[PDB]
Design a protein around this ligand. Structure first.
Ligand code: LZM
Length: 290
């Protein structure tokens, strides 16, 4: 693209290469995404108007030469590297709470417009020096489906995937995003992924092992989902105090609601913003290494 000067490759999404680049007329540095169906162009252009302080701004959509490029605001780090970087000591809780609170704000906005992310994970949560956290690639899954490999044949992570998706539900809701964000929340607290599955059954069975094999008591209609099998092992549910120590009562309460099996029982973003866990939320600034 002639108006852009590629500074460096900085990623490789499900969708393709991500470059840091600098607008040749506007001086602007941006994230340049290389990704043509009529539908997909009409879906992306909706995304241009879906603006929020906790959503990485889509600056431009360039359709030229049957190539598609998306230009986003550039942020210098993602939550994955920040988490690796804070492995030895952990993210201080007040910072974890701030990030969760901002991310729920993002989702509450998106969801109010009936837009899902579908593929939340630490690598798509982008952090700045100001104590801000933003959701990247929002709305991209519906525009281009969610691949098993990346264009680089990289394996797409299952770790944050909701059970109803794993169980073959076609028509899933905004609750899928709540699940993922609860998995990330647990991960920030404990410094280990909650459910690090390396296939779909392994991901489903890691879920069942911590939370209990769902049944018709806790999840009405589960046994009639497309990929449910009566032969599932029946595992007992673990208590959360074992799952996420040393998270406090409020956090653990909030966490369990974000991880309800039944997508209709699972906490909404808007209702999670009201949880008393956030009573004393503040906005710390992280110490970063640019
Ligand atoms: N999409 C996107 C995006 C915006 N800023 N970024 C920095 C690093 C990696 N990806 C991005």
């Amino acid at each position: 693209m002639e108006n852009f000067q590629k500074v460096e490759k900085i990623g490789e999404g499900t969708y393709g290469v991500v470059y840091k680049a600098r607008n040749k007329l506007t001086g602007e540095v941006v994230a340049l995404k290389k990704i043509v169906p009529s539908t997909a162009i009409r879906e992306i252009s909706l995304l241009k108007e879906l603006n929020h302080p906790n959503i990485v701004k889509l600056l431009d959509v360039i359709h030229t030469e049957n190539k598609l490029y998306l230009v986003f605001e550039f942020l210098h780090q993602d939550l994955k590297k920040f988490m690796d970087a804070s492995a030895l000591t952990g993210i201080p809780l007040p910072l974890i709470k701030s990030y969760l609170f901002q991310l729920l704000q993002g989702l509450a906005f998106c969801h109010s417009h009936r837009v899902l992310h579908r593929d939340l994970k630490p690598q798509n949560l982008l952090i700045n020096t100001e104590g801000a956290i933003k959701l990247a690639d929002f709305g991209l899954a519906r525009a281009f489906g969610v691949p098993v490999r990346t264009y680089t044949h990289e394996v797409v992570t299952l770790w944050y995937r909701a059970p109803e998706i794993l169980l073959g539900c076609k028509y899933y809701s905004t609750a899928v995003d709540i699940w993922s964000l609860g998995c990330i929340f647990a991960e920030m607290v404990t410094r280990r992924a909650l459910f690090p599955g390396d296939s779909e059954i392994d991901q489903l069975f890691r879920i069942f092992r911590t939370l209990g094999t769902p049944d018709e008591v806790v999840w009405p209609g589960v046994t009639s989902m497309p990929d449910y099998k009566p032969s599932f092992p029946k595992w007992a549910r673990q208590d959360f105090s074992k799952v996420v120590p040393p998270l406090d009562e409020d956090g653990r309460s909030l966490l369990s609601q974000m991880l309800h099996y039944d997508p209709n029982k699972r906490i909404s973003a808007k209702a999670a913003l009201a949880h008393p866990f956030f009573q004393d939320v503040t906005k710390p600034v992280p110490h970063l290494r640019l």
